[PDB]
Amino acid sequence: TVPQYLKQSHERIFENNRAWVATKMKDDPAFFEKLSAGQTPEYLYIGCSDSRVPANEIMGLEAGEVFVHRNIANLVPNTDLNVMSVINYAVRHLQVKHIVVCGHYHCGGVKAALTPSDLGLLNPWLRNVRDVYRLHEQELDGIQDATARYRRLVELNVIESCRNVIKTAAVQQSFHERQFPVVHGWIFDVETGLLRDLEIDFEETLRDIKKIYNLA
Amino acid sequence: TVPQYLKQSHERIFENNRAWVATKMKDDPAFFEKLSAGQTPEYLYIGCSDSRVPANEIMGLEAGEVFVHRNIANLVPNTDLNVMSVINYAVRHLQVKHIVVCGHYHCGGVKAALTPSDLGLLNPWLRNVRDVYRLHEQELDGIQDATARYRRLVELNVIESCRNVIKTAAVQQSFHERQFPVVHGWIFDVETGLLRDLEIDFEETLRDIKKIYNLA
């Protein structure tokens, strides 16, 4: 019942992996023990499942230095145990120094969230993007250009994901008693390859959140 | 406020990104046109948040060819909207031909799931790993060596994640009506960088799942 082309495609991946390992052995033999050495990551990166470039390459780090979560539209929903487990583990167990949320403008989950279709299973997840729009409706309604409005929605979605990280007890507690981690919101431009810091202002955002949720 | 070293560390990432873009301009004339190509991924890769190497490198593919999800212990829980959204989007919208779950032996979420502690918010997520043990208790109890037992648990966790992918309506409907996608379970060996195919029987697993849930 499984077409032969899918079996060949799968077998080609294993050929590519063997070639990739051969090339790493000739060019960089130290990589395998370095890879297996055991490193604690200093970064948590939350990005889009539609990955354009691996986080560690963008950041010029080794993959073992970045704990990674990717999901549709780089969301941090309040009641998502998947992302909340990544955050609580990275802070309380790995003691990461930085949490980054990184979005991009390339048509993915955010554009999917703007299509007025019943996508069954997907509607609840994409609703979180639509709720970012509703939080910033006064700003986004006033932006005439379709591309500009879409880009600002992508930015504000990163900013609200960052807000949702900062709201976690784990981030508050750890920053109070250890001065880390700090939360950053970034945009990756696929047209230029450049990161842009959206300059979240971790401390101000934390202050605003603490108005009804001051742990100490 | 926030310590100076965190600010310096964040600043270094931006310097690395600039350097990284320079080297990509020399080595690959159309990288940034390729990076924004709009090319639809043929693979969904579900792996561990404790990533050792990017999926697309291991598989010798470009990052835009691999839709990615990473979570603690590479789980596909029934009730997790985060992972179920990644799977439903990849199948129904991207029409990926392959879904891969890939685990590895480097101490991560699986080892955390074997620590008999109250980790608050983490308990429900890590419980899924403990339930893999209980499903395969006779087999794992028969393995005397701690490292061998741990390794087999990591493999069975990949296998059960793959079974949870195959159980999705999206995978069954699409495979019935179009003969794709196929699901594969892999182990990445950090010592050698080689993939190992766990040879999950997609046809047999789909046949077993269909006994009470035959879509057509």
Automatic annotation (TrEMBL), chains A, B:
| Keyword match Metal-binding | yes
Listed A to Z, the keywords are: Lyase, Metal-binding, Zinc
Question: Mind telling me which Pfam families this protein's record contains?
Answer: Pro_CA
Q: Where does Zn(2+) bind?
A: C48, D50, H104, C107
Record's GO cellular component terms: cytoplasm
E.C. code: 4.2.1.1
Q: Does the keyword Hydrolase apply?
A: no
Per the entry, which co-factors are needed? Zn(2+)
Q: Which SMART domains match?
A: Pro_CA
Q: How is the cofactor bound?
A: Binds 1 zinc ion per subunit.
Q: Catalytic activity annotated for this protein?
A: hydrogencarbonate + H(+) = CO2 + H2O
Any one GO MF term held by the record is: carbonate dehydratase activity
Single GO biological process annotation from the record: cellular response to oxidative stress
User: Which positions, given as ranges, span the membrane?
Assistant: none
Main enzyme class: lyase
Annotated Gene3D superfamilies: Carbonic anhydrase
Cystine bridges: C48-C107
**PROSITE patterns under this entry?**
PROK_CO2_ANHYDRASE_1
- Family according to the record: Belongs to the beta-class carbonic anhydrase family.
Q: Sum up the protein's function in the record's words.
A: Reversible hydration of carbon dioxide.
Protein name, UniProt field: Carbonic anhydrase
Tell me the lineage of the source organism. Answer: Eukaryota, Fungi, Dikarya, Ascomycota, Pezizomycotina
